[PDB]
C-alpha cells in the first residue's frame, strides 16, 4: 500500500521495422534509463505510446511534454494534449502522431529526451529522462 490515483507505467516507441521491443518500464528505477538508449534507423516512422492508469477519480487536462536535447543543448519542445480520464481497470494508452526519426549523416547520433506527464493542476504525475541514438542501420 498505497495506490496513487494516477500511475504512469510505460513508454513504448512503436516502430514496425524495429527488430526488437523499445519499451521503458516507468514503474522501476527511472535513473537507469540515463545510461541506456533506444536505437532507431534514420528516417524511420514511429509513434511514442505513453501507458498510464487512473484508479479512483477523474483527472482533467492530462498533458504529455517532451523536451529534446542534443549533447545537453535543448533543441525542441513538443506538448501533446492527452485529455480528461476517469478511473478504470485497464491501462490507458496515449499515442503521439506518427513522426520520422532524423535522417542524413549530420542529423545522426545521440539525443536525450526529458519527458513529463502532467495535468491542468500541474501535477507531476511522472518525470523521466531517456535517450535515442539515430544510426544508419539497425
- The CA distance from 5 to 10, in Å, is 16
Give the integer Cα–Cα distance in Å for 63 and 53.
Answer: 14
Count Cβ atoms below 10 Å from residue 134 Cβ, excluding itself. 20
* Residue 126, domain CATH: 2.70.50.30
In this structure, what C-alpha cell is assigned to residue 56?
479512483
**Whole-Å CA distances, 131 to 3, 76, 136:** 29, 14, 17
Q: Which three cell numbers stand for residue 27?
A: 514503474
Question: 123 lies in which domain range?
Answer: 1-138
C-beta atoms surrounding 40 within 10 Å: 23
Which residue carries 503521439 as its cell? 96
Domain count, the chain: 1
Cα distance between residue 40 and residue 63, in whole Å: 25
Q: What is the resolution of this structure in A?
A: 1.6
Method: X-ray
Amino acid at each position: 500500500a498505497m495506490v496513487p490515483n494516477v500511475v504512469v507505467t510505460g513508454l513504448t516507441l512503436v516502430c514496425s521495422s524495429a527488430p526488437g521491443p523499445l519499451e521503458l518500464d516507468l514503474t522501476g528505477d527511472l535513473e537507469s534509463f540515463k545510461k541506456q538508449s533506444f536505437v532507431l534507423k534514420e528516417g524511420v516512422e514511429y509513434r511514442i505510446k505513453i501507458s498510464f492508469r487512473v484508479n479512483r477519480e477523474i483527472v482533467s487536462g492530462m498533458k504529455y511534454i517532451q523536451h529534446t536535447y542534443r549533447k545537453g543543448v535543448k533543441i525542441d519542445k513538443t506538448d501533446y494534449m492527452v485529455g480528461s480520464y476517469g478511473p478504470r481497470a485497464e491501462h490507458y494508452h496515449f499515442l503521439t502522431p506518427v513522426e520520422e526519426a532524423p535522417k542524413g549523416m549530420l542529423a545522426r547520433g545521440s539525443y536525450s529526451i526529458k519527458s513529463r506527464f502532467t495535468d491542468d493542476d500541474k501535477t507531476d504525475h511522472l518525470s523521466w529522462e531517456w535517450n535515442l541514438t539515430i544510426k544508419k542501420d539497425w
